[PDB]
Design a protein around this ligand. Structure first.
Ligand SMILES: [Ca+2]
Lengths: 403, 379
């Protein structure tokens, strides 16, 4: 009982019943040729080795038939005629069916290996070339901060050729594994306890949004069942299902878990556009990474729009030079000197304040929220050393001061 | 006599490094030269950086340059081995110049593949283990051996990596094909080299007395007539090792009848027959016809639209439809080809509307499937 799997018993049955019969027929042909024919007093005979009979039967089973070795006794010949009619019949199953079974193995088996220095995130749910490419293009974008996170895909299927190509292009920081977050063994393969976060993507174009949400709620249940403290970020296609998640006994919004609900957000943006036309195209561009790319063949209004689409929202700690400024003069200072727009601040328990009035002053290590062309731009608000250094108009100059 | 000196140099290269890896793993198990080097080698071998991109394309091109020198060696002379003075032949010098560059690229990989047992056993490491050491023995020893130098033909399987790292092959079917073609040209060239070695060396069991002087080109021919299962036997194997290798090779290449030749013929046949564009003459008018296009609807339309009782107007009819025409429709289009055209596409696509020059078209006609499953969906 060592051969557990149905395919393994089948193969071994195919292999051994092919090695037997082949060896057996080589012995019978060797006998018939080396004995010679009894009809001719054994005078008609041909001195083959057994190895030449094995060779001869392989080149006839394959229907190659060189005829460098060939049968010459009338019994030998006969046996070859019978044997051909058998082994053309054994072209059903055997070589094609063993190649099928031996090809059905799993390409993306095995485990992730976690280095101590690197962080990683596990990505699961709806994984496809379009969803992965839309995700990777923003997640590893040049305007984003120079963080070194590895991305581990876990999915219950073989990747398509274009997805294998995409994974190959990013193989320095991207991995893919066959499996499902429904299985605790696969959660160990991807070292989910050491993972920094887990992202569950949704099929926004599914046949039933409520079944896609039910499947994603399971995943979240299965991931949290394996280890409570994993930060889970999940995509939901209907707000009426978000509740369910709130009950899972370990969803803790305060810890980081989140649920981006494409309904709540969509309709929301559209609502804001009723109160301020156009907003939805302001915000949507703000939350997607994009570098500006001027071109010929593009109208004046399109260049102005494109420059605007280049900007994204970023967040950074305000330098010590901002200490005790009121928010309005800190924001004025950012726009005028730093060439950054400051919207909001983290106020220390924790809360977020948007455009707070003169009553609010910048405390030490206040985190700000900014609009800028890239993460490299926003760092000026951290390095800015006030009148101790920062008095030259090419903003590019700003860099980490001596004290 | 001396030939085993070359092959042994390959084996001690493989074994000594393998044992070093094992004792290193065992010492750890009893118990910038940092991850920066692993990452830096990674991008290089991956074309993230432009320098990596240049280096990887140049490894690929020099692999062909070394393979061509093996064809020149196999085409020239007679014996598999000869006592040539090492400095004398230009081809032997310039192959060593490529050989040292592959040795450099190897280590680089070693770094990216992180000094590991599984890497030390990966296929392209063996290609090197067997090529680099014999060419270095050939510096010490005034002799040349063809000595498994054909194995470079495996490095040609880098083509799909090069063309996907440089990213010129856009379509899924194109990467698949090129993967099929190159993994068929490699293996075929490789097996021809191995059969050529085994027959021209003769069998070791018979003191190399049993031998057969094939050219490499006769081995390529012989492997094509056995892969196709034709088997003339005008050329045939005669060393026992050779024979064996043919028996093994048949069992492999009957298995590779799954995919390869039928699947490449499928992919190469799936092209679009009615691609391309209309060309508008200044004098002629045309009309574009789309929607429900079929032999019965087109024949009912044409029969009235070009009828003899109608005025002698000279309008050309351009069909645009999202499918391949049936045989009877191709026949009808052929009969009227003087004033009728057909193009693959859909009026839902602005590129197809340009292909048919819809701005210069006199009118556009949209036909309906009057016998559809739901009239409201057809509308
Ligand atoms: Ca940007």
């Amino acid at each position: 009982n060592v051969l557990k799997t149905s395919t393994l018993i089948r193969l071994v049955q195919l292999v051994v019943s092919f090695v037997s019969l082949w060896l057996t027929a080589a012995g019978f042909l060797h006998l018939l040729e080396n004995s010679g024919d009894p009809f001719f007093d054994f005078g008609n005979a041909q001195h083959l080795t057994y190895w030449e009979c094995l060779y001869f039967l392989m080149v006839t089973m394959s229907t190659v038939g060189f005829g460098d070795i060939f049968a010459t006794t009338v019994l030998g010949r006969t046996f070859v005629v019978i044997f051909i009619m058998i082994f053309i019949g054994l072209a059903a199953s055997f070589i094609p069916e063993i190649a099928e079974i031996l090809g059905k193995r799993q390409k993306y088996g095995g485990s992730y290996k976690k280095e101590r220095g690197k962080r990683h995130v596990v990505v699961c749910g709806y994984i496809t070339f379009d969803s992965v490419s839309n995700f990777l293009k923003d997640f590893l974008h040049k305007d984003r901060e120079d963080v070194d996170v590895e991305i581990v895909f876990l999915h219950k299927g073989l990747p398509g050729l274009e997805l294998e190509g995409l994974l190959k292009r990013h193989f320095t920081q991207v991995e893919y594994f066959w499996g499902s977050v429904m299985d605790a063994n696969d959660l160990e393969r991807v070292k989910i306890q050491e993972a920094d976060a887990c992202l569950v993507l949704a099929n926004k174009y599914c046949q039933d949004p409520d079944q896609e949400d039910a499947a994603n709620i399971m995943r979240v249940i299965s991931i949290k069942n394996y280890h409570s403290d994993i930060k889970v970020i999940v995509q939901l296609l209907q707000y009426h299902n978000k509740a369910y998640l709130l009950n899972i006994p370990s969803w803790d919004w305060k810890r980081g878990d989140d649920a981006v609900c494409v309904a709540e957000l969509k309709l929301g943006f559209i609502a804001q556009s009723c109160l301020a036309p156009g907003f939805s195209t302001l915000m949507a561009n703000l939350f997607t990474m994009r570098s500006y790319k001027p071109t010929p063949e593009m109208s004046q209004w399109q260049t102005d729009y494109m420059r605007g689409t280049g900007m994204e929202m970023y967040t950074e700690y305000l330098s010590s030079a901002f200490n005790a400024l009121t928010f309005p003069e800190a924001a004025e200072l950012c726009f005028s000197k730093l060439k950054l727009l400051l919207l909001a601040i983290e106020v220390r328990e924790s809360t977020l304040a948007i455009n707070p009035g003169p009553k609010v002053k910048i405390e030490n290590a206040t985190q700000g929220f900014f609009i800028a062309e890239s993460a490299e731009e926003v760092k000026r608000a951290f390095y800015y050393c006030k009148n101790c250094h920062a008095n030259v108009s090419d903003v590019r100059q700003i860099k980490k001061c001596k004290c | 006599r001396q030939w085993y000196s070359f092959l042994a140099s390959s084996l001690v290269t493989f074994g000594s490094g393998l044992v070093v890896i094992i004792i290193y793993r065992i010492v750890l198990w009893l118990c910038g030269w940092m991850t920066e080097a692993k990452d830096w080698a990674g991008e290089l071998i991956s074309g993230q950086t432009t320098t990596g991109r240049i280096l990887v394309g140049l490894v690929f091109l020099l692999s062909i340059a070394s393979l061509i020198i093996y064809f020149i060696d196999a085409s020239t002379n007679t014996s598999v081995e000869t006592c040539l003075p090492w400095s004398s032949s230009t081809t032997q010098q310039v192959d060593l110049a490529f050989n040292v560059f592959f040795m450099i690229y190897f280590f680089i990989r070693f770094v990216a593949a992180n000094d590991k047992l599984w890497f030390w056993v990966e296929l392209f490491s063996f290609v090197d283990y067997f090529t680099i050491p014999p060419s270095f023995v050939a510096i010490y020893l005034d002799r040349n051996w063809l000595g498994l130098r054909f194995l470079r033909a495996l490095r040609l399987m880098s083509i799909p990596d090069i063309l996907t790292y440089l990213n010129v092959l856009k379509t899924s079917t194109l990467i698949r094909l090129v993967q099929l073609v190159v993994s068929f040209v490699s293996l075929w060239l490789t097996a021809a080299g191995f059969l050529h070695l085994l027959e021209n060396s003769g069998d070791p069991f018979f003191d190399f007395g049993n031998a057969q002087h094939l050219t490499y080109w006769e081995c390529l021919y012989f492997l094509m007539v056995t892969m196709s299962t034709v088997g003339f036997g005008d050329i045939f194997a005669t060393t026992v090792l050779g024979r064996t290798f043919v028996v093994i090779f048949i069992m492999i290449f009957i298995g590779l009848a799954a995919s390869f030749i039928p699947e490449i013929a499928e992919i190469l046949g799936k092209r679009q027959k009615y691609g391309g564009s209309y060309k508008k003459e200044r004098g002629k008018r045309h009309v574009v016809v789309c929607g429900y296009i079929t032999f019965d609807s087109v024949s009912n339309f044409l029969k009235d639209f070009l009828h003899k009782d109608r005025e002698d107007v000279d309008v050309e009819i351009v069909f645009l439809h999202k499918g391949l025409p049936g045989l009877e429709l191709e026949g009808l289009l052929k009969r009227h080809f003087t004033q009728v055209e057909y193009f693959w596409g859909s009026v839902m696509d602005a590129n197809d509307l340009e292909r048919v020059k819809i701005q210069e078209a006199d009118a556009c006609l949209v036909l309906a499937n009057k016998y559809c499953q739901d009239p409201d969906q057809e509308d």
